[PDB]
Every structure is written in structure tokens, then in C-alpha cells.
Amino acid sequence: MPFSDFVLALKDNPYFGAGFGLVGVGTALAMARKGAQLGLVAFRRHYMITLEVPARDRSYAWLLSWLTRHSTRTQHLSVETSYLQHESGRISTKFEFIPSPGNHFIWYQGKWIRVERNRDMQMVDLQTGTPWESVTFTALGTDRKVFFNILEEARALALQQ
Amino acid sequence: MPFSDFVLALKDNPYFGAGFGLVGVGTALAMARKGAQLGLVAFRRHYMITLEVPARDRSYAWLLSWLTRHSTRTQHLSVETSYLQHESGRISTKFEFIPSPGNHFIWYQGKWIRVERNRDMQMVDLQTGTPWESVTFTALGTDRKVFFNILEEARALALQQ
Amino acid sequence: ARDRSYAWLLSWLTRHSTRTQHLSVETSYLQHESGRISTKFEFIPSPGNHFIW
Amino acid sequence: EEGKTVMYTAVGSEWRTFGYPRRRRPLDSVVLQQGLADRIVKDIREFIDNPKWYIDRGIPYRRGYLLYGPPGCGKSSFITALAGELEHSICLLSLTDSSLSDDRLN
Amino acid sequence: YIDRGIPYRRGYLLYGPPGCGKSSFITALAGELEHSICLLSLTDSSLSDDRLNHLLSVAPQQSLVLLEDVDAAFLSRDLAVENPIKYQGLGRLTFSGLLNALDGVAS
Amino acid sequence: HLLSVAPQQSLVLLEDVDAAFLSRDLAVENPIKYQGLGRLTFSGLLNALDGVAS
Amino acid sequence: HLLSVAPQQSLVLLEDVDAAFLSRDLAVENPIKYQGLGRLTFSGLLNALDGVAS
Numbered sequence A, B: 001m002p003f004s005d006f007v008l009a010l011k012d013n014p015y016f017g018a019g020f021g022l023v024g025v026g027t028a029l030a031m032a033r034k035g036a037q038l039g040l041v042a043f044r045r046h047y048m049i050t051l052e053v054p055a056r057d058r059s060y061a062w063l064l065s066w067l068t069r070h071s072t073r074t075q076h077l078s079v080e081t082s083y084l085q086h087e088s089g090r091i092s093t094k095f096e097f098i099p100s101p102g103n104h105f106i107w108y109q110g111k112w113i114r115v116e117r118n119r120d121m122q123m124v125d126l127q128t129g130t131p132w133e134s135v136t137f138t139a140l141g142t143d144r145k146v147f148f149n150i151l152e153e154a155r156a157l158a159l160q161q
Numbered sequence C: 001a002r003d004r005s006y007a008w009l010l011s012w013l014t015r016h017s018t019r020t021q022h023l024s025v026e027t028s029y030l031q032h033e034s035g036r037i038s039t040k041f042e043f044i045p046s047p048g049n050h051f052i053w
Numbered sequence D: 001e002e003g004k005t006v007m008y009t010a011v012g013s014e015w016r017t018f019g020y021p022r023r024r025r026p027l028d029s030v031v032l033q034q035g036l037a038d039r040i041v042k043d044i045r046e047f048i049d050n051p052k053w054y055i056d057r058g059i060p061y062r063r064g065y066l067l068y069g070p071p072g073c074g075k076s077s078f079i080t081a082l083a084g085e086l087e088h089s090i091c092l093l094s095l096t097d098s099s100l101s102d103d104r105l106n
Numbered sequence E: 001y002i003d004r005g006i007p008y009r010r011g012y013l014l015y016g017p018p019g020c021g022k023s024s025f026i027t028a029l030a031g032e033l034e035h036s037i038c039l040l041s042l043t044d045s046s047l048s049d050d051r052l053n054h055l056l057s058v059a060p061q062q063s064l065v066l067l068e069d070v071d072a073a074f075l076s077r078d079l080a081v082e083n084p085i086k087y088q089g090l091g092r093l094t095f096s097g098l099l100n101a102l103d104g105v106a107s
Numbered sequence F, G: 001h002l003l004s005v006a007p008q009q010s011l012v013l014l015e016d017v018d019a020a021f022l023s024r025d026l027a028v029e030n031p032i033k034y035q036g037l038g039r040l041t042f043s044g045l046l047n048a049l050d051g052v053a054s
């Protein structure tokens, strides 16, 4: 009875026709959401490069210094006060600007890198002040040598000045 | 009275017909949601294999090392700075890349494994730095020997180099 | 849970639960009259809504 | 776990197995003074086999043993061999622990 | 060892005036035997008797456990004559714990 | 760990070593007591300066 | 750190220095014990006042 009686019962109500019309809408809506996730995942896996740096590595320090230096004209900075000893023998306050947390864009080597200064989540870490800060270098392409070049240049700049 | 009077009262309003047309829509929507969960559960139970590895096992260390080595051209890496002693007698910085947390895909033994570097949830664990990090090897199929082969190869690679 | 009434009432719920099928296990060592001790599998109603008459 | 000896340990307030079941040490592999091993085995098996003699007189059904002597003469090895012979397990208790209290010990 | 019931363990002690070649010989021996070295610090702060037993029970296969400068873990000589062998350390390790870990029932 | 991850081309400087541990009469005495604040021991320093893992 | 980030054109004032550490008979004795409350040592103060990183 559930098969035959319902089919007649559903066919009796014209609102049922609009109902299965809405049923197809819901099925298409669920498919559309699924299509989005798979497309994003495939695009990230095949055409994007990502380099996360934790705060537990010296590479974090060198990369942060290189981001302070090479930031083009970034206008989302944060202040950092330090005492700089002049060659005259005295010390004066030095106003240094570091890119504040957010999404910044650079044009290194003809690409458009999408560095992101990750903020603090839960104040848990080791060998530091426990802020668990991080940076994520995202760029469009398939070559990995860009991030290696960035890291090597950061090390060279750290060994410079 | 509730049976007879309501039936006449419902039949009086033509909007009632559309409402019970919408009632069937709600029942179908709930059924469709239930159909999704049971389908997912059955598919996972019958045609997929999953191997979770906690951070409390040496298997975690070996498998993490093997994931660092065999990652194909994965472009979702994270840095890991270490000092490597050259045969010349000096030590230089070694830039090692480990797949950053996310979903990575490999083609081991003709399958498409779906490794996932689980992140830190609540920073509670023992015998480690308490990050509760994990990896989950998901693949399509019914054979379990693939994950055993992966673990054995990870152990062999750990005993190598 | 701050009252001995809790302990007594929990014990009474363990005993009088009719045929409740939402139980939880509780392993304890029961000393037999023969002089030895054996494991006792005791079932306490697991958290949830139970109905009695 | 048969053919091997299980060794438990104190984890909080419960006895949890420690490692894997160790292989049994043969009883004749431990050479004690003449008749000592037989005496101890007979005593412990008499205690195990007679709970009624304890119940009928109100005596608590417990027993304790003490092995003393200069180090390296075979106390721990004999205990392992005895546990293997009696098919018992060993619950290692460390009195000089940090988490051990009187209530926890009881 | 198996055919006679003897536990399959061995231990070595190298003693002498400082700088005569104990640690260097241990390193050379580990290289020769293709083993690894598990450095254990008895006078630690997180080391307990149960933790010591566990650590000695899960040592990597084909490895040498190395307890260097054992005499610094516990009081000695006049204290050895004295009733207690006091733990002159930082953690919760005891002389009996070390003795039972090195050669005991659960070793 | 700290002695194992020192930056390359650097000099590790342990200034005023005699203040770390008891000395002279204690050096003659059986233990070289750590007259300090942390959880460092004489054997630990000895093995760090020149040991197996140095 | 505190001695390294003092405001410019300022005088650091350490008043009653003799109360920080044991003295006289202890100064003759091998250790200069810290008769204080925190985790400061005589060598630490000596290196902070005039050391390598001062």
C-alpha cells in the first residue's frame, strides 16, 4: 500500500508537483555546495602553492625580518619601538613598522604572493612568548622555487645589516 | 469534535491544501536529510578504508617522516629549519619542508590516498609537546594491506638514511 | 550529588529499574560465601530518560 | 596470556597491565637452599587450597611472605618462578611513590 | 639464555679517572655495533620509578642505554654506610626504583 | 639542546662558572652540589660540554 | 633586559645594595649567597652592571 496509495495520494495534490519541484531545488542546492568544495580543493591542490611557517623555528624570525624589510608600500603596519645606538655615541628611539596581522600582497619575481600574518589563537606555544603566530605564503602557480628563494633571501638579509 | 470539526475547518481554507502540500515538503526534506546520513555511513563502512594515527605512538614519528619524504610535488608544505653537519666538518642550515596541515593526495600503488594532517584542537597530550596532532589515511577500496605496506615502508625508510 | 540521598537513590534506581535497556556497566569484586572472590557485572541505568510505573 | 606471566602496575587507583606478558621462568631454573622452594610452594598451595579452614574459624583469608638475604641470591627470580608455577600474575607496588596515599594504598 | 631461564640482559661499567676514554669508547662501540645510544639522565626532574621502568621497557631495538655518571644520582660512601641511600637528585627517583628497573621482576 | 642549536659562527660564553656549583671543601666532599636556582646538575654540564651527544 | 631598556637621560638607582647579597663572613666564604626573594644571583648582577651585553 505505501507504494501505490501514496503515488495516487501525491498525484491528487497539485501542491505536490510544486513540492517535488522544490525537491529538485534542494537536491541541486546540495550538489552546488558539493561542487564548490571539490572545485576549491582541486584548484588549491593543482594550481596554488602554500608555505606555512610556525613560531617554533628560526626561519620564522628570519622571514618576519624579511617581511618587515620588503613590504613595498604596505599600509597595514604595526609599530615596534626600539632603542638604536647612533654612531655619535648616544641612543635614540627608533620607530620601526612591521606589517600588522592581515592579508598583504607583494610582487616578488613577477608573481603576486599573498602573505598573511596569522594572529594568536589560544596563547599556547613553547620557546617563545606563547602567542602561536604564523605566516602563510600563498601564490598562484606550480613552481616551489619561489618560496625557497624567499627563504634564502631572508637568511641572507638576516646575515646582512 | 477535534476529528470531525477540524476536518471541515481544514477543508474550508484552500490555504490548508497548500499547507499540507508544504507538510509533505517538510516530511520529504527530513527524509532526504536522513537518506544522506545513511548513505554516507554505508559507503564509508563498505567501500572506504581509514587509518588514524595518534601522536602517542612512534608510528606517528615514522609515518610523519615518510610523509615528509614521499609527498610527490605537494604544494601545501610547511618549513622546518635544522642544522645539517656536512662531511667537510662544518654545519649549515637545512631547509626541510613538511606538508602543512590540510588534505593531500598521493598515488601510492595505483590508489588515491587522502592523507590529512590533523591540527591541534585543545593542546592536551602526553609524552610530547601536547599538540595532539594526527594523520588520517583515507582511500577508496576494501583491502587493508595498502596501509600496512605504507607503515612497513615508513619503518624501513626510518631505518634507512 | 552532594547528598547521601544521592547515593541511596542511585542504589534504588539500580535495583528497581524494571527491564530498562539503557544501562551502563559497573564492575566490582564480590566475595562468595565459599571464601573466594569473583568479578560481579552490575548494570546501572546509563544517563538518559527512563520510565517506571 | 597462558604460558606467560602478566605483570600489572598501579595507574592511579587501578591495576593496569604493564607491557606485554613476560615469558615464564622455569621453577627449576632457580636453585635455592635444599627444600626451601618445595616448602614455600607447598605452603602457598596449602593456603590457596583451603579457604574453608579459614572461614570456619574466622581467620582472615590472607597470607604474606618475606624473603630476605644478601643481594643477588635469588629472591626476585624465585618470585617470578613461583608466579609462573602457580599461574598467577604479579602486581608490582612501589611504596616509595609520589601519588601513593593511605586511602589509595587501601 | 632462553634454554636456561636467565634473563636476556647485560650491563657494563666503565670506571676510571676523567678523560681516559669512557664516553669516546662508548661512541666508538655504538658505531662498530651499528647500534644507537639512548641517553638517560637519572638526576632529572620528571623521572619517576614507574617512568624509569617504562622508559627502559620501550627502548628502541638494537640500542645501548647509557647512564653516565651514576655516582651523582645517589649519596654514597658515608651515606652508603648510613641506613638510607638518599637520592641527591631533582625528580622522584629512588635507589630501589633504579635497582628494580636495572634488574628486577618487570625488567 | 641549547648547546646543540647554537647559531653557526658563534661563541658560547659561560661567565663566572665557579658560581654555578659548590667548590673547594665541597669539591673534596662527595657531592658537587648545585648552588643554583634551576634543575641543572654537575654531571649534566659535564656531559653537555664534552659528552656523547655534544 | 631592564638595564638595557632604561629610558634615555635617566639615572638607574640601586639603593641599599648590601641587602641584596650576604656579606663579610660570607664574602670570605666560598659562595656570595643571595639573601633575597627572587631568582637573582651575584654573577647576574655583576654581568648586568658591567659585562659583555651591558
Ligand SMILES: Nc1ncnc2c1ncn2[C@@H]1O[C@H](COP(=O)(O)OP(=O)(O)OP(=O)(O)O)[C@@H](O)[C@H]1O
Pocket (backbone or CB within 6 Å): D029, D030, D031, D032, D070, D071, D072, D073, D074, D075, D076, D077, D078, E005, E006, E007, E099, E103, E104
Ligand atoms: N638461586 C639462583 N638460581 C639461579 N639463578 C640465580 C639464583 N640467584 C640469583 N640468580 C641469578 O642472579 C640474577 C639476579 O638474581 P635476583 O634478581 O633473583 O637476585 P636477588 O637476590 O633477588 O636481588 P634483588 O632483590 O636486587 O632483585 C639473575 O640472572 C638470576 O638468574
Ligand SMILES: Nc1ncnc2c1ncn2[C@@H]1O[C@H](COP(=O)(O)OP(=O)(O)OP(=O)(O)O)[C@@H](O)[C@H]1O
Pocket (backbone or CB within 6 Å): E017, E018, E019, E020, E021, E022, E023, E024, E025, F050, F051
Ligand atoms: N684512548 C683515547 N684515544 C683517543 N682519544 C681519547 C682517548 N681517551 C680520551 N680521548 C679524548 O679525550 C677527550 C674526552 O674523552 P672521553 O669523553 O672519552 O673521556 P672520559 O673517560 O669519558 O671522561 P669524562 O667522564 O670526563 O667525560 C676527547 O677529545 C677524546 O678524543
Ligand SMILES: [Mg+2]
Pocket (backbone or CB within 6 Å): D075, D076, E104
Ligand atoms: Mg629483587
Ligand SMILES: [Mg+2]
Pocket (backbone or CB within 6 Å): E019, E022, E023, E024, F050, F051
Ligand atoms: Mg666522559
